[PDB]
């Protein structure tokens, strides 16, 4: 259970999203 890779994001990351959380992974694609 690890926190998201994104600075100051306190969601949990997941493996499918490369250690980002789902929300940040979605924005990472958008940007």
């Amino acid at each position: 259970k690890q926190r998201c890779r994104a600075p100051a994001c306190d969601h949990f990351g997941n493996a499918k999203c490369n250690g980002y959380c789902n929300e940040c992974f979605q924005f990472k694609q958008m940007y």
């Binding site: 994104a6 600075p7 929300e23 940040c24 940007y31």
Partner: protein, 74 residues
């Protein structure tokens, strides 16, 4: 003055600002440079979420301070 904003990917951008700039103004600058709608921006400084109607000066944000940008849907 100039401040730094560290983003999702760990990329850091520079912004040219004034102490009297509001957080709203800062998000408008990030929208300009990055294309991100201000309503999806959350700016964090010293562990606290920053409110749109307040100024950088209000939050004791000085030249070369680094803010963290977190993106959130709705």
């Amino acid at each position: 003055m100039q401040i730094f904003v560290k983003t999702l990917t760990g990329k850091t951008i520079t912004l040219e600002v004034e102490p009297s700039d509001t957080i709203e103004n800062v998000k408008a600058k990030i929208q300009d440079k990055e294309g991100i709608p201000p309503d999806q921006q959350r700016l964090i400084f010293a562990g606290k979420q920053l409110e749109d109607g307040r100024t950088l000066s209000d939050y004791n944000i000085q030249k070369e301070s680094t803010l963290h940008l977190v993106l959130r849907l709705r």
